[PDB]
Amino acid sequence: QNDGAVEITSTTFESNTVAKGISNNLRIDYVISLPDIFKDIEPDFDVKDGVVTLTGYMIIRFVGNSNIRKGVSYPVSIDLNGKPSTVYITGEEYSNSSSGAQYPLMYKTADLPTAATDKEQGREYYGEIVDRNKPIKYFVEINLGDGVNPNTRSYLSNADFFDNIPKGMALDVNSICIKRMGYYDERSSDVTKDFWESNRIKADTKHLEINFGDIRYERYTVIYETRITSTESGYLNDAKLYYDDKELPSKHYSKLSKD
């Protein structure tokens, strides 16, 4: 396949199988019709109902759809100055819920270095706050799964996050920042303005409450900042996700250094 300037040498997939929620890509070493089993298509550029107009190469990233069938091949055509050239990817299906719910549904971490403190049986880790006047940035990753396969995520009905901020700390309510990643989505997307505007965030200096509703295999991150108001021995931040008649805590202890 050669038009003149451009000689398409090869056309190869990352995996020659494709499945529901799984990252893949076409790679075209030198208009391209993708079928209805390819959601979330993205590398001039174009995406037009699964049709993509444009010694190097070109990677078109896609993700498999709900309507894939195990064993069935599906065409991707590659039309350059007429002369159309078709290759095939075979559908696959994994029983996703048959993987027993092992991945934690919430972590609460911080933008601090770690020190240890030896205890009667174990070391407690903690965030060392070196500078009392600079703020402490907490992150909270709700429904991560493994962090690459979105089928490792859950369905959480009536999800309602709730953090009591530690005594001697004060939440900057303006610092609150909710990122969202849908099942099919590629990157996080700042949905903070959407959540304030739809009456989901109730937050004073001592409290946080986000009402996510039905988390539908959706990874939410929650970044907020805090400031030291009063000296304490430590600062045990207590996050709590309430989902479908359950409660789940995450905890981040942090202490000031010797100064």
PDB file of C-alpha atoms in Angstrom:
ATOM      1  CA  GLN A   1       0.000   0.000   0.000  1.00  0.00           C
ATOM      2  CA  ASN A   2       1.906   3.098  -1.404  1.00  0.00           C
ATOM      3  CA  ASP A   3       0.343   6.414  -2.748  1.00  0.00           C
ATOM      4  CA  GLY A   4       3.649   8.365  -3.381  1.00  0.00           C
ATOM      5  CA  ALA A   5       5.098  10.395  -0.438  1.00  0.00           C
ATOM      6  CA  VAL A   6       3.622   7.906   2.175  1.00  0.00           C
ATOM      7  CA  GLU A   7       4.281   4.063   2.182  1.00  0.00           C
ATOM      8  CA  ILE A   8       2.149   2.312   4.945  1.00  0.00           C
ATOM      9  CA  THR A   9       4.718  -0.448   5.901  1.00  0.00           C
ATOM     10  CA  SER A  10       2.671  -2.116   8.760  1.00  0.00           C
ATOM     11  CA  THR A  11      -0.696  -1.968  10.670  1.00  0.00           C
ATOM     12  CA  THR A  12      -0.589  -3.774  14.105  1.00  0.00           C
ATOM     13  CA  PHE A  13      -2.627  -3.709  17.399  1.00  0.00           C
ATOM     14  CA  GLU A  14      -1.121  -3.503  20.964  1.00  0.00           C
ATOM     15  CA  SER A  15      -3.237  -6.649  21.673  1.00  0.00           C
ATOM     16  CA  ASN A  16      -4.872  -8.583  18.739  1.00  0.00           C
ATOM     17  CA  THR A  17      -7.759  -9.249  21.277  1.00  0.00           C
ATOM     18  CA  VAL A  18     -10.223  -6.486  22.480  1.00  0.00           C
ATOM     19  CA  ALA A  19     -12.536  -6.555  25.598  1.00  0.00           C
ATOM     20  CA  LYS A  20     -15.018  -4.451  27.702  1.00  0.00           C
ATOM     21  CA  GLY A  21     -13.154  -1.508  29.392  1.00  0.00           C
ATOM     22  CA  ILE A  22      -9.590  -2.611  28.310  1.00  0.00           C
ATOM     23  CA  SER A  23      -6.947  -0.172  26.871  1.00  0.00           C
ATOM     24  CA  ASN A  24      -5.724  -1.007  23.307  1.00  0.00           C
ATOM     25  CA  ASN A  25      -4.413   0.941  20.212  1.00  0.00           C
ATOM     26  CA  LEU A  26      -3.975   0.719  16.397  1.00  0.00           C
ATOM     27  CA  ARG A  27      -0.392   1.724  15.243  1.00  0.00           C
ATOM     28  CA  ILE A  28       0.201   2.661  11.525  1.00  0.00           C
ATOM     29  CA  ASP A  29       3.911   2.821  10.465  1.00  0.00           C
ATOM     30  CA  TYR A  30       4.494   4.815   7.168  1.00  0.00           C
ATOM     31  CA  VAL A  31      -9.232   8.175   6.857  1.00  0.00           C
ATOM     32  CA  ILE A  32      -9.556   5.051   9.179  1.00  0.00           C
ATOM     33  CA  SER A  33     -13.060   3.517   9.944  1.00  0.00           C
ATOM     34  CA  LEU A  34     -13.268   1.921  13.481  1.00  0.00           C
ATOM     35  CA  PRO A  35     -16.321  -0.331  14.244  1.00  0.00           C
ATOM     36  CA  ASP A  36     -19.077   0.234  16.909  1.00  0.00           C
ATOM     37  CA  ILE A  37     -17.151  -2.011  19.489  1.00  0.00           C
ATOM     38  CA  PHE A  38     -14.535   0.901  19.887  1.00  0.00           C
ATOM     39  CA  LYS A  39     -15.512   3.638  22.450  1.00  0.00           C
ATOM     40  CA  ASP A  40     -13.226   6.523  23.677  1.00  0.00           C
ATOM     41  CA  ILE A  41     -11.160   7.099  20.443  1.00  0.00           C
ATOM     42  CA  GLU A  42      -8.345   9.759  20.541  1.00  0.00           C
ATOM     43  CA  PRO A  43      -4.729  10.129  19.222  1.00  0.00           C
ATOM     44  CA  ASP A  44      -4.702  17.864  12.331  1.00  0.00           C
ATOM     45  CA  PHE A  45      -7.134  15.304  13.948  1.00  0.00           C
ATOM     46  CA  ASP A  46     -10.812  14.123  13.732  1.00  0.00           C
ATOM     47  CA  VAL A  47     -13.373  11.706  15.378  1.00  0.00           C
ATOM     48  CA  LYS A  48     -16.707  11.433  13.388  1.00  0.00           C
ATOM     49  CA  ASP A  49     -18.973   8.479  14.497  1.00  0.00           C
ATOM     50  CA  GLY A  50     -15.895   6.140  14.697  1.00  0.00           C
ATOM     51  CA  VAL A  51     -14.136   7.545  11.531  1.00  0.00           C
ATOM     52  CA  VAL A  52     -10.664   9.201  11.991  1.00  0.00           C
ATOM     53  CA  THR A  53      -9.074  11.534   9.322  1.00  0.00           C
ATOM     54  CA  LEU A  54      -5.531  13.040   9.818  1.00  0.00           C
ATOM     55  CA  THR A  55       9.783   7.177   8.207  1.00  0.00           C
ATOM     56  CA  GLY A  56       7.378   7.810  11.194  1.00  0.00           C
ATOM     57  CA  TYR A  57       4.233   6.297  12.882  1.00  0.00           C
ATOM     58  CA  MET A  58       0.695   7.224  14.181  1.00  0.00           C
ATOM     59  CA  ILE A  59      -0.964   5.616  17.327  1.00  0.00           C
ATOM     60  CA  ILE A  60      -4.849   5.765  17.528  1.00  0.00           C
ATOM     61  CA  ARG A  61      -5.762   4.792  21.186  1.00  0.00           C
ATOM     62  CA  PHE A  62      -9.209   3.097  21.774  1.00  0.00           C
ATOM     63  CA  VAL A  63     -11.080   1.023  24.478  1.00  0.00           C
ATOM     64  CA  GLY A  64     -13.457  -1.973  23.946  1.00  0.00           C
ATOM     65  CA  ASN A  65     -17.272  -1.562  24.338  1.00  0.00           C
ATOM     66  CA  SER A  66     -20.177  -3.370  26.179  1.00  0.00           C
ATOM     67  CA  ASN A  67     -21.267  -5.023  22.826  1.00  0.00           C
ATOM     68  CA  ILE A  68     -18.025  -7.139  22.219  1.00  0.00           C
ATOM     69  CA  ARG A  69     -18.658 -10.928  21.670  1.00  0.00           C
ATOM     70  CA  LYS A  70     -15.967 -13.627  22.416  1.00  0.00           C
ATOM     71  CA  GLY A  71     -14.595 -15.319  19.220  1.00  0.00           C
ATOM     72  CA  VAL A  72     -16.084 -12.720  16.745  1.00  0.00           C
ATOM     73  CA  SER A  73     -13.578 -10.743  14.536  1.00  0.00           C
ATOM     74  CA  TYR A  74     -14.442  -7.046  13.726  1.00  0.00           C
ATOM     75  CA  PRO A  75     -13.030  -4.941  10.802  1.00  0.00           C
ATOM     76  CA  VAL A  76     -10.853  -1.756  11.057  1.00  0.00           C
ATOM     77  CA  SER A  77     -10.485  -0.360   7.437  1.00  0.00           C
ATOM     78  CA  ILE A  78      -7.515   1.970   6.459  1.00  0.00           C
ATOM     79  CA  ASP A  79      -8.410   3.966   3.238  1.00  0.00           C
ATOM     80  CA  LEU A  80      -5.434   6.060   1.778  1.00  0.00           C
ATOM     81  CA  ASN A  81      -6.016   7.652  -1.737  1.00  0.00           C
ATOM     82  CA  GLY A  82      -8.683   4.981  -2.439  1.00  0.00           C
ATOM     83  CA  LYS A  83      -7.049   1.480  -2.206  1.00  0.00           C
ATOM     84  CA  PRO A  84      -8.778   0.351   1.065  1.00  0.00           C
ATOM     85  CA  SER A  85      -6.886  -2.133   3.389  1.00  0.00           C
ATOM     86  CA  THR A  86      -8.841  -4.026   6.174  1.00  0.00           C
ATOM     87  CA  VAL A  87      -7.381  -5.790   9.315  1.00  0.00           C
ATOM     88  CA  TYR A  88      -9.303  -7.587  12.184  1.00  0.00           C
ATOM     89  CA  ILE A  89      -9.371  -7.733  16.083  1.00  0.00           C
ATOM     90  CA  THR A  90     -11.086 -10.741  17.842  1.00  0.00           C
ATOM     91  CA  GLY A  91     -13.532  -9.921  20.706  1.00  0.00           C
ATOM     92  CA  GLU A  92     -13.074 -11.524  24.186  1.00  0.00           C
ATOM     93  CA  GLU A  93     -15.225 -11.661  27.395  1.00  0.00           C
ATOM     94  CA  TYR A  94     -13.914 -12.029  31.014  1.00  0.00           C
ATOM     95  CA  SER A  95     -16.294 -12.752  33.973  1.00  0.00           C
ATOM     96  CA  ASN A  96     -15.323  -9.521  35.880  1.00  0.00           C
ATOM     97  CA  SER A  97     -17.510  -9.848  39.079  1.00  0.00           C
ATOM     98  CA  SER A  98     -16.179 -13.516  39.417  1.00  0.00           C
ATOM     99  CA  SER A  99     -12.907 -11.749  40.499  1.00  0.00           C
ATOM    100  CA  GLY A 100     -13.665 -11.530  44.295  1.00  0.00           C
ATOM    101  CA  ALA A 101     -13.896  -7.890  45.608  1.00  0.00           C
ATOM    102  CA  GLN A 102     -10.245  -7.651  46.915  1.00  0.00           C
ATOM    103  CA  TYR A 103      -9.260  -4.021  45.851  1.00  0.00           C
ATOM    104  CA  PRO A 104      -9.829  -1.307  48.561  1.00  0.00           C
ATOM    105  CA  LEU A 105     -12.717   1.153  47.776  1.00  0.00           C
ATOM    106  CA  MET A 106     -10.925   4.185  49.442  1.00  0.00           C
ATOM    107  CA  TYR A 107      -7.317   5.274  50.320  1.00  0.00           C
ATOM    108  CA  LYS A 108      -6.485   8.607  52.097  1.00  0.00           C
ATOM    109  CA  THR A 109      -2.838   9.719  51.452  1.00  0.00           C
ATOM    110  CA  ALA A 110      -0.958  13.092  51.777  1.00  0.00           C
ATOM    111  CA  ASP A 111       1.769  15.277  50.115  1.00  0.00           C
ATOM    112  CA  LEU A 112       4.239  14.667  53.028  1.00  0.00           C
ATOM    113  CA  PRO A 113       7.391  12.508  53.583  1.00  0.00           C
ATOM    114  CA  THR A 114       7.000   9.386  55.854  1.00  0.00           C
ATOM    115  CA  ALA A 115       8.633   8.788  59.292  1.00  0.00           C
ATOM    116  CA  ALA A 116       8.038   5.774  61.637  1.00  0.00           C
ATOM    117  CA  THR A 117       7.400   5.543  65.451  1.00  0.00           C
ATOM    118  CA  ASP A 118       8.071   2.145  67.159  1.00  0.00           C
ATOM    119  CA  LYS A 119       5.020   0.775  69.131  1.00  0.00           C
ATOM    120  CA  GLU A 120       4.401  -2.293  71.419  1.00  0.00           C
ATOM    121  CA  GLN A 121       3.895  -4.513  68.288  1.00  0.00           C
ATOM    122  CA  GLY A 122       4.503  -2.634  64.976  1.00  0.00           C
ATOM    123  CA  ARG A 123       5.770   0.681  63.467  1.00  0.00           C
ATOM    124  CA  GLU A 124       3.056   3.407  62.971  1.00  0.00           C
ATOM    125  CA  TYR A 125       3.884   5.484  59.806  1.00  0.00           C
ATOM    126  CA  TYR A 126       2.929   9.218  59.742  1.00  0.00           C
ATOM    127  CA  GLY A 127       3.207  12.332  57.501  1.00  0.00           C
ATOM    128  CA  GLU A 128       6.081  14.546  58.829  1.00  0.00           C
ATOM    129  CA  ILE A 129       4.890  18.235  58.593  1.00  0.00           C
ATOM    130  CA  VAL A 130       8.369  19.987  58.419  1.00  0.00           C
ATOM    131  CA  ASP A 131       6.820  23.539  57.894  1.00  0.00           C
ATOM    132  CA  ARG A 132       3.824  24.397  60.220  1.00  0.00           C
ATOM    133  CA  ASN A 133       2.754  27.503  58.108  1.00  0.00           C
ATOM    134  CA  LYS A 134       2.705  25.784  54.608  1.00  0.00           C
ATOM    135  CA  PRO A 135      -0.574  23.804  54.026  1.00  0.00           C
ATOM    136  CA  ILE A 136      -0.990  19.932  54.028  1.00  0.00           C
ATOM    137  CA  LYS A 137      -2.537  18.522  50.752  1.00  0.00           C
ATOM    138  CA  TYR A 138      -4.650  15.331  51.378  1.00  0.00           C
ATOM    139  CA  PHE A 139      -5.627  13.089  48.369  1.00  0.00           C
ATOM    140  CA  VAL A 140      -8.571  10.567  48.612  1.00  0.00           C
ATOM    141  CA  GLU A 141      -8.877   7.950  45.763  1.00  0.00           C
ATOM    142  CA  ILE A 142     -12.449   6.448  45.899  1.00  0.00           C
ATOM    143  CA  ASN A 143     -12.996   3.314  43.680  1.00  0.00           C
ATOM    144  CA  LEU A 144      -9.445   3.006  42.147  1.00  0.00           C
ATOM    145  CA  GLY A 145      -9.498  -0.788  41.570  1.00  0.00           C
ATOM    146  CA  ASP A 146      -6.006  -1.879  40.378  1.00  0.00           C
ATOM    147  CA  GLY A 147      -5.694   1.656  38.760  1.00  0.00           C
ATOM    148  CA  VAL A 148      -5.509   0.407  35.052  1.00  0.00           C
ATOM    149  CA  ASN A 149      -8.458  -2.065  34.416  1.00  0.00           C
ATOM    150  CA  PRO A 150     -11.796  -0.265  35.178  1.00  0.00           C
ATOM    151  CA  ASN A 151     -13.554  -3.718  35.571  1.00  0.00           C
ATOM    152  CA  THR A 152     -11.692  -3.957  38.985  1.00  0.00           C
ATOM    153  CA  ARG A 153     -13.931  -0.967  40.102  1.00  0.00           C
ATOM    154  CA  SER A 154     -17.312  -1.531  41.927  1.00  0.00           C
ATOM    155  CA  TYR A 155     -20.965  -0.341  41.797  1.00  0.00           C
ATOM    156  CA  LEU A 156     -21.443   1.697  45.073  1.00  0.00           C
ATOM    157  CA  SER A 157     -25.165   2.688  45.493  1.00  0.00           C
ATOM    158  CA  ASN A 158     -25.749   5.916  47.587  1.00  0.00           C
ATOM    159  CA  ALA A 159     -21.994   6.699  48.042  1.00  0.00           C
ATOM    160  CA  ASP A 160     -21.567   9.593  50.581  1.00  0.00           C
ATOM    161  CA  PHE A 161     -17.949  10.501  51.585  1.00  0.00           C
ATOM    162  CA  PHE A 162     -17.586  12.266  55.014  1.00  0.00           C
ATOM    163  CA  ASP A 163     -14.259  13.562  56.535  1.00  0.00           C
ATOM    164  CA  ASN A 164     -14.084  15.063  60.088  1.00  0.00           C
ATOM    165  CA  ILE A 165     -10.898  17.272  59.839  1.00  0.00           C
ATOM    166  CA  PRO A 166      -8.520  16.820  62.882  1.00  0.00           C
ATOM    167  CA  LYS A 167      -8.594  19.238  65.897  1.00  0.00           C
ATOM    168  CA  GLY A 168      -5.788  21.815  65.367  1.00  0.00           C
ATOM    169  CA  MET A 169      -6.529  21.836  61.545  1.00  0.00           C
ATOM    170  CA  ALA A 170      -8.821  23.964  59.267  1.00  0.00           C
ATOM    171  CA  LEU A 171      -9.962  22.833  55.744  1.00  0.00           C
ATOM    172  CA  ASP A 172      -9.530  25.528  53.059  1.00  0.00           C
ATOM    173  CA  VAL A 173     -13.065  24.886  51.545  1.00  0.00           C
ATOM    174  CA  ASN A 174     -11.896  26.664  48.290  1.00  0.00           C
ATOM    175  CA  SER A 175      -8.973  24.086  47.921  1.00  0.00           C
ATOM    176  CA  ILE A 176     -11.561  21.163  47.492  1.00  0.00           C
ATOM    177  CA  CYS A 177     -11.135  19.614  43.981  1.00  0.00           C
ATOM    178  CA  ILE A 178     -13.154  16.515  42.761  1.00  0.00           C
ATOM    179  CA  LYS A 179     -11.653  14.740  39.671  1.00  0.00           C
ATOM    180  CA  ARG A 180     -13.760  11.957  37.947  1.00  0.00           C
ATOM    181  CA  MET A 181     -12.798   9.121  35.520  1.00  0.00           C
ATOM    182  CA  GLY A 182     -15.727   7.229  33.884  1.00  0.00           C
ATOM    183  CA  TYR A 183     -15.452   3.457  33.088  1.00  0.00           C
ATOM    184  CA  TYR A 184     -14.568   4.266  29.407  1.00  0.00           C
ATOM    185  CA  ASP A 185     -12.734   7.641  30.115  1.00  0.00           C
ATOM    186  CA  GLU A 186      -8.936   7.961  29.559  1.00  0.00           C
ATOM    187  CA  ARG A 187      -7.938  10.891  31.912  1.00  0.00           C
ATOM    188  CA  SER A 188      -9.366  12.465  35.076  1.00  0.00           C
ATOM    189  CA  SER A 189     -11.716  15.494  34.466  1.00  0.00           C
ATOM    190  CA  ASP A 190     -12.239  18.354  37.025  1.00  0.00           C
ATOM    191  CA  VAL A 191     -15.991  17.925  38.021  1.00  0.00           C
ATOM    192  CA  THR A 192     -15.547  20.293  41.091  1.00  0.00           C
ATOM    193  CA  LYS A 193     -17.787  23.149  39.713  1.00  0.00           C
ATOM    194  CA  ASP A 194     -20.501  20.529  38.737  1.00  0.00           C
ATOM    195  CA  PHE A 195     -20.559  19.127  42.362  1.00  0.00           C
ATOM    196  CA  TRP A 196     -20.910  22.595  44.104  1.00  0.00           C
ATOM    197  CA  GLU A 197     -23.631  23.656  41.532  1.00  0.00           C
ATOM    198  CA  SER A 198     -25.722  20.399  42.047  1.00  0.00           C
ATOM    199  CA  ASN A 199     -25.698  20.663  45.942  1.00  0.00           C
ATOM    200  CA  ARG A 200     -23.350  17.664  46.633  1.00  0.00           C
ATOM    201  CA  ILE A 201     -20.454  19.342  48.674  1.00  0.00           C
ATOM    202  CA  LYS A 202     -21.377  20.586  52.226  1.00  0.00           C
ATOM    203  CA  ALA A 203     -18.035  21.853  53.757  1.00  0.00           C
ATOM    204  CA  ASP A 204     -17.057  24.163  56.715  1.00  0.00           C
ATOM    205  CA  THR A 205     -13.467  24.510  58.188  1.00  0.00           C
ATOM    206  CA  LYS A 206     -14.035  21.423  60.509  1.00  0.00           C
ATOM    207  CA  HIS A 207     -16.126  19.168  58.070  1.00  0.00           C
ATOM    208  CA  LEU A 208     -16.279  17.730  54.479  1.00  0.00           C
ATOM    209  CA  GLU A 209     -19.234  15.771  52.948  1.00  0.00           C
ATOM    210  CA  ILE A 210     -19.455  14.807  49.214  1.00  0.00           C
ATOM    211  CA  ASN A 211     -22.685  12.942  48.129  1.00  0.00           C
ATOM    212  CA  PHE A 212     -21.538  11.016  44.965  1.00  0.00           C
ATOM    213  CA  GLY A 213     -24.934   9.209  44.497  1.00  0.00           C
ATOM    214  CA  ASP A 214     -24.534   5.925  42.530  1.00  0.00           C
ATOM    215  CA  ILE A 215     -20.763   5.565  41.723  1.00  0.00           C
ATOM    216  CA  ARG A 216     -21.221   3.544  38.425  1.00  0.00           C
ATOM    217  CA  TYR A 217     -17.700   1.965  37.987  1.00  0.00           C
ATOM    218  CA  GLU A 218     -16.382   5.602  38.267  1.00  0.00           C
ATOM    219  CA  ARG A 219     -12.971   6.438  39.857  1.00  0.00           C
ATOM    220  CA  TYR A 220     -13.330   9.717  41.902  1.00  0.00           C
ATOM    221  CA  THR A 221     -10.196  11.483  43.336  1.00  0.00           C
ATOM    222  CA  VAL A 222     -10.749  14.207  46.061  1.00  0.00           C
ATOM    223  CA  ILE A 223      -7.771  16.645  46.595  1.00  0.00           C
ATOM    224  CA  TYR A 224      -8.175  19.249  49.436  1.00  0.00           C
ATOM    225  CA  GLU A 225      -5.708  21.358  51.549  1.00  0.00           C
ATOM    226  CA  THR A 226      -5.642  22.105  55.332  1.00  0.00           C
ATOM    227  CA  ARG A 227      -3.725  24.582  57.631  1.00  0.00           C
ATOM    228  CA  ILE A 228      -2.307  24.150  61.210  1.00  0.00           C
ATOM    229  CA  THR A 229      -4.447  26.362  63.591  1.00  0.00           C
ATOM    230  CA  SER A 230      -3.197  24.807  66.941  1.00  0.00           C
ATOM    231  CA  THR A 231      -0.183  22.624  68.052  1.00  0.00           C
ATOM    232  CA  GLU A 232      -1.070  18.908  68.717  1.00  0.00           C
ATOM    233  CA  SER A 233       0.855  15.614  69.341  1.00  0.00           C
ATOM    234  CA  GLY A 234      -0.695  14.368  66.026  1.00  0.00           C
ATOM    235  CA  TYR A 235      -3.466  14.887  63.393  1.00  0.00           C
ATOM    236  CA  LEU A 236      -5.493  11.656  62.718  1.00  0.00           C
ATOM    237  CA  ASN A 237      -7.657  12.607  59.663  1.00  0.00           C
ATOM    238  CA  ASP A 238     -10.766  10.274  59.610  1.00  0.00           C
ATOM    239  CA  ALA A 239     -12.366   9.704  56.138  1.00  0.00           C
ATOM    240  CA  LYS A 240     -15.567   7.502  55.977  1.00  0.00           C
ATOM    241  CA  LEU A 241     -17.278   6.285  52.703  1.00  0.00           C
ATOM    242  CA  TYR A 242     -20.959   5.246  53.338  1.00  0.00           C
ATOM    243  CA  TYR A 243     -22.238   2.956  50.458  1.00  0.00           C
ATOM    244  CA  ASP A 244     -25.419   0.677  50.399  1.00  0.00           C
ATOM    245  CA  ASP A 245     -25.852  -0.020  54.217  1.00  0.00           C
ATOM    246  CA  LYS A 246     -21.992  -0.247  54.789  1.00  0.00           C
ATOM    247  CA  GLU A 247     -19.278   2.085  56.228  1.00  0.00           C
ATOM    248  CA  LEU A 248     -15.511   1.961  55.324  1.00  0.00           C
ATOM    249  CA  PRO A 249     -12.839   4.160  57.042  1.00  0.00           C
ATOM    250  CA  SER A 250      -9.460   5.411  55.690  1.00  0.00           C
ATOM    251  CA  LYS A 251      -6.997   7.096  58.157  1.00  0.00           C
ATOM    252  CA  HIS A 252      -3.906   9.376  57.682  1.00  0.00           C
ATOM    253  CA  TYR A 253      -2.016  10.146  60.951  1.00  0.00           C
ATOM    254  CA  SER A 254       0.471  13.107  60.578  1.00  0.00           C
ATOM    255  CA  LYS A 255       2.717  14.749  63.309  1.00  0.00           C
ATOM    256  CA  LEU A 256       4.829  17.996  63.326  1.00  0.00           C
ATOM    257  CA  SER A 257       8.676  17.500  63.271  1.00  0.00           C
ATOM    258  CA  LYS A 258      11.061  18.699  66.104  1.00  0.00           C
ATOM    259  CA  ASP A 259      11.223  22.172  64.262  1.00  0.00           C
TER     260      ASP A 259
END
